[PDB]
Amino acid sequence: MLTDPIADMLTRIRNATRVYKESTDVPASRFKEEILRILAREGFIKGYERVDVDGKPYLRVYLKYGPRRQGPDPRPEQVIHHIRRISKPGRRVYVGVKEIPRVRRGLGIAILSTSKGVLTDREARKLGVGGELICEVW
Amino acid sequence: VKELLEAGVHFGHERKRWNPKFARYIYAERNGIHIIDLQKTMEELERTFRFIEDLAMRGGTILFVGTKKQAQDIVRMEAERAGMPYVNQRWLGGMLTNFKTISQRVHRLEELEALFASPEIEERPKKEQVRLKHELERLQKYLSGFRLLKRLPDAIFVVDPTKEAIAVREARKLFIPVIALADTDSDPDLVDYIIPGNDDAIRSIQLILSRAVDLIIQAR
RNA sequence: UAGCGCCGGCCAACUCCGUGCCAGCAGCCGCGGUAAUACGGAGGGCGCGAGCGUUACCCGGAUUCACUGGGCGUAAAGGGCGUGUAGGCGGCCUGGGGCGUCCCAUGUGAAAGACCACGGCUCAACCGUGGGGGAGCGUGGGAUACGCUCAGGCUAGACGGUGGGAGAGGGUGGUGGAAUUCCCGGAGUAGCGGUGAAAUGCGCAGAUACCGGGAGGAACGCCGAUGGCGAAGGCAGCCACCUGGUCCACCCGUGACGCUGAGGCGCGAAAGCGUGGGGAGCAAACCGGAUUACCCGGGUAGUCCACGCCCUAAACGAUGCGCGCUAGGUCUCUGGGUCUCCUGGGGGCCGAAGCUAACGCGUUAAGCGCGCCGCCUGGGGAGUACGGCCGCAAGGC
RNA sequence: AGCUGUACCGGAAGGUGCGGCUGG
């Protein structure tokens, strides 16, 4: 059974990006929409769009890749090198303001579900709040 | 179109052979064959000819590869109608990565060609002459046309990217731009400038190579 | 006043003499059996220095118990397989409560120690003054994205309804033929059988080969396949009855009713055991013949049935179960359609991305992820010892 | 060609019976 939707969405994105697909589809929800939004501003994905497949609402994600490379293995570079799930069902990770992680010395982002919405580490630190540590992307 | 259509350019291979990465250049399937989209052919052809024409004016050279049975004559004829080198008998392992070693063979060819033009061959008993002549003819067979390359080429022209995969790999390794006349069973990623057309059908090869050579001619 | 340990590699620091598998050194790998930079001495050298080495114990190195931060196809490691209790975990939309969660304020969090800044002993060790930090709890207030709970809905999971399909799936009855053996009758005579070649054996009380009748037991040739079914073990003559699982179409009904599962309960090839039958062929042990096993001729258990035990394996795909995503090509079994083709479910080969120590795996994953269970921690001793549970016993856990 | 569960071995440098596996 589908136990974790968010991990599923992240895995869908990773699998799509590893084979340089221009677009992926994921079952739609508000929470996934928030994650996609946060990803959208930071310029990881090209952009998300709400669509309907057989009446079932889906989110279609348009992905982003670097320029075509030169020499052997001409496959273009990735914009999302690495994406993980931190807080999983059966082990939830909650962090205070002090304990908010720094990813790749500020190159990468971490997504927090704070009491004041879904934010990045930078936004959370500015607002001085913590919460559930969803994922880290770089 | 209107020249490509009647040349059998759009006639691809069957569904048993096609590479999925090529699906973007496919229009439709008919009667157990894959049809290659021709508007995409036009666009890619325009782009590749722009590149070729720029390279021709700049002063670089293009090595005409292709060793398919029905492509050899066309390759030779189109290449000789230019200063461009060509390979149409066999692609020796390391014509590009091992350029210095093959250049020694080129020098051996030139020295032997000079020797048989000399009356000094009357020594070295007749059977030694026989082995020398065999060596010379082997060298001419495999290295005629390749003699024009004084150094590494500036681009490569491959008739069938799948067939001459070794040449494609070498060129990739040495940062040499690749131009190829691909079909349904080819990998679009490995070709820098692709002309989605036919690798068989003499007519298609004739048309494409003729146009390219004429463009090179008027570009000079 | 200047000692102490080292000088093969780890590990900074090299020559001579003495000995010759001796005497000896050793933390590991290892040196010494004649020219030893490894033993003993000398000269030099290196490292510390009123200290320098050794033994014992703790942390590190050890990511070598892996929460940070490991693993199980072949290196140690997927339970023999189901059903399922406790537990763990759990789709989409809206509202309430603020339990977890986050934040602010405040009370604690003794001194000494630790940290920072100044000082006093001629410096330091030591000590003094001041400031801050601090995991964790108590009280007050706030937020509601996520997890929880309570309500109201939804159909994408799950389960039903209707119509149809394939199958060595299981149990109980019942009959069909081929073949071996044996008994009776007929006809016919000197070998038959067996081996690499022979022997033991059977046969003049008539064997072998042949024909006819009868008795009994066990297994089902051709189709038969790289096939099909089942959770595994495993399942082939045919007919009937009873019965389990599963696939497809319609997309009609319920509206999260789900996944996994320590114990428990059930099933579990073969070989064995008990109580009664049965016994044709084959055949452990055993008895003879050739030539150490092998091979040949006999032969008890056993193989078969009923009931009750036993519970093991190369019980294997050496790969736990469920769900989602990630190019394809080809062969095949079985449904549906708008039947060149398209769309489901099984079984096989070759291969994208990727993974792997490699072999290889690759939509039937050993790829990328989530949930739950089992198991591993160097080899031998050892599945041994003792203890406990089970078994008639062998033995099993 | 080996290996393996089980059961025997008064011509065990190991053999045989009934099954299983390819790790031939």
**CA-wise closest residue to B190 among B209, B163, B171:** B171
A21 contact to strand C (CB, 7 A limit)? yes
- The separation between the first and the last C-alpha atoms of chain A, rounded to the nearest angstrom, is 29
Task: Considering all nucleic acid strands, name the nucleotide whose C1' atom is nearest to the C-alpha of residue A92.
Answer: C147
Distances (CA, A) of B123 to B56, B114, B117, B126, B137: 47, 15, 14, 8, 20
Residue B153, C-beta contacts closer than 8 angstroms, at least 6 positions apart: B60, B61, B62, B63, B85, B176
* Cβ–Cβ < 8 Å for B178, B191: yes
Task: Considering all nucleic acid strands, name the nucleotide whose C1' atom is nearest to the C-alpha of residue A1.
Answer: C323
* Cβ–Cβ < 8 Å for B96, B170: yes
B190: which 2 tokens?
């490995």
Distances (CA, A) of B39 to A25, A110, B166: 29, 45, 30
* Cβ–Cβ < 8 Å for A110, A87: no
DSSP chain A: ----HHHHHHHHHHHHHHTT-SEEEEE--HHHHHHHHHHHHTTSSSEEEEEEETTEEEEEEE--B-PPP-SSS-PPPBS---EEE-SBTTB--EE-STT----GGGTSEEEEEETTEEEEHHHHHHHT--EEEEEEE-
A3: which 2 tokens?
């136990």
DSSP B4-67: SGGGTTTEEEETTT--GGGGGGEEEEETTEEEEPHHHHHHHHHHHHHHHHHHHHHT--EEEE--
- A75 contacts B172? CB cut-off 8 A: no
Between CA B154 and CA B193 the distance in angstroms is 14
Cα torsion B52, B54, B56, B59: sign = negative
Between CA B60 and CA B52 the distance in angstroms is 10
Element (H, E) at B129: helix B126-143
Chain A CB contacts of B23 below 8 Å: none
Q: Determine if residue B118 is left, alpha or beta; phi over 0 gives left, psi from -120 to 50 gives alpha, anything else beta.
A: beta
**CA-wise closest residue to B111 among B149, B143, B153:** B143
Between CA B196 and CA B47 the distance in angstroms is 12
Chain A, 49-78: which CBs lie within 7 Å of strand C?
Answer: 55-57
Between CA B187 and CA B158 the distance in angstroms is 13
Between CA B197 and CA B186 the distance in angstroms is 11
Task: Considering all nucleic acid strands, name the nucleotide whose C1' atom is nearest to the C-alpha of residue A114.
Answer: C145
C-beta neighbour count of B175 within 10 angstroms: 10
Rounded to the nearest 5°, which phi and psi values hold at B216? -60, -45
A137: which 2 tokens?
């992307």
Residues belonging to chain A with any Cβ–Cβ distance to chain B shorter than 8 Å: 70-72, 74-75
Chain B CB contacts of A74 below 8 Å: 172, 189-190
C-beta neighbour count of A80 within 10 angstroms: 20
Pairing state of beta strands A23-27 and A56-62?
Answer: antiparallel
* Cβ–Cβ < 8 Å for B156, B177: yes
B140: which 2 tokens?
């001419």
B198: which 2 tokens?
């036919």
* Cβ–Cβ < 8 Å for B87, B65: yes
Pairing state of beta strands B178-180 and B193-194?
Answer: parallel
Between CA A51 and CA A137 the distance in angstroms is 25
Q: CA–C1' distance B166–C294 (Å)?
A: 59
Superfamily in which the B99-146 domain is placed by CATH? Helix hairpin bin (1.10.287.610)
DSSP B159-220: S-TTTTHHHHHHHHHTT--EEE---TTS-TTS-SEE--S-SS-HHHHHHHHHHHHHHHHHH-
Amino acid letter, B146: F
* Cβ–Cβ < 8 Å for B55, B84: no
Q: Determine if residue B205 is left, alpha or beta; phi over 0 gives left, psi from -120 to 50 gives alpha, anything else beta.
A: alpha
Angle at B190 between CA B187 and CA B191, to 5 degrees: 95
Q: Which residue of B has its CA nearest to A21?
A: B21
Chain B, 87-106: which CBs lie within 7 Å of strand C?
Answer: none
A138: which 2 tokens?
């770089």
Q: CA–C1' distance A98–C111 (Å)?
A: 30
Between CA B193 and CA A21 the distance in angstroms is 21
Between CA A42 and CA B69 the distance in angstroms is 54
Between CA A118 and CA A134 the distance in angstroms is 9
Residue A15, C-beta contacts closer than 8 angstroms, at least 6 positions apart: none
Chain A, 76-115: which CBs lie within 7 Å of strand C?
Answer: 84-85, 88-92, 94-98, 113-115
**CA-wise closest residue to A114 among A101, A105, A123, A103:** A123
Q: The tokens 């090179």 sit on which residue?
A: B216
Give the resolution value in Å: 3.3
A134 contact to strand C (CB, 7 A limit)? no
